[PDB]
Design a protein around this ligand. Sequence first.
Ligand SMILES: NC(=O)[C@H](Cc1c[nH]c2ccccc12)NC(=O)[C@H](Cc1cc(-c2ccccc2)no1)CP(=O)(O)c1ccccc1
Ligand SMILES: [Ca+2]
Ligand SMILES: [Ca+2]
Ligand SMILES: [Ca+2]
Ligand SMILES: [Ca+2]
Ligand SMILES: [Ca+2]
Ligand SMILES: [Cl-]
Ligand SMILES: [Cl-]
Ligand SMILES: [Cl-]
Ligand SMILES: [Zn+2]
Ligand SMILES: [Zn+2]
Length: 159
Amino acid sequence: FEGDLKWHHHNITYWIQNYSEDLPRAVIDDAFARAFALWSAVTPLTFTRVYSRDADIVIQFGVAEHGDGYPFDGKDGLLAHAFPPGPGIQGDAHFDDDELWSLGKGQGYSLFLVAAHQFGHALGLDHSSVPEALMYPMYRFTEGPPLHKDDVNGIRHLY
Ligand SMILES: NC(=O)[C@H](Cc1c[nH]c2ccccc12)NC(=O)[C@H](Cc1cc(-c2ccccc2)no1)CP(=O)(O)c1ccccc1
Ligand SMILES: [Ca+2]
Ligand SMILES: [Ca+2]
Ligand SMILES: [Ca+2]
Ligand SMILES: [Ca+2]
Ligand SMILES: [Ca+2]
Ligand SMILES: [Cl-]
Ligand SMILES: [Cl-]
Ligand SMILES: [Cl-]
Ligand SMILES: [Zn+2]
Ligand SMILES: [Zn+2]
């Protein structure tokens, strides 16, 4: 994940490989679309859902070991991870399905916020030192616009 590359195109495509059993597919698709919309709203980037491995960002829910050298740890802890821009697995976003995925206030983790964070990494964004920023390393649920001034500046500095 220590990559230093950005996408050389702005028409990004994503493929939802599979789903979590905690939420309806329609809810999941909408959550991801809304997470992407957060970044496309402040950049010339566009995100189009596709149905092929040829997508730039492949999204998948997994548990424990799932193919890469970074297995999930089950309940809590690591919630998900994504690889920086590049071919192959690069740009892909993985979500730990051992977590209780939900939305808004309440128990469990907001798939919307975590996705937005993950897509940030999939776009090449590094972590923020601002505790209130979306790209902060530690998950924290709060209401209001997910993107903090620092997140906007970071993404705009790249695209
Ligand atoms: N419960 C949390 O806040 C955990 C804590 C954590 C960070 N790194 C690790 C590593 C191993 C275990 C836990 C953990 N953070 C995450 O699951 C984030 C993912 C995350 C953060 C958020 C988030 C942060 C701030 C505000 C809102 C959501 N949603 O999803 C991991 P990352 O920053 O995407 C990452 C990816 C690749 C390599 C190394 C780290
Ligand atoms: Ca735009
Ligand atoms: Ca990819
Ligand atoms: Ca976990
Ligand atoms: Ca789950
Ligand atoms: Ca909730
Ligand atoms: Cl599925
Ligand atoms: Cl939204
Ligand atoms: Cl939410
Ligand atoms: Zn993975
Ligand atoms: Zn992160």
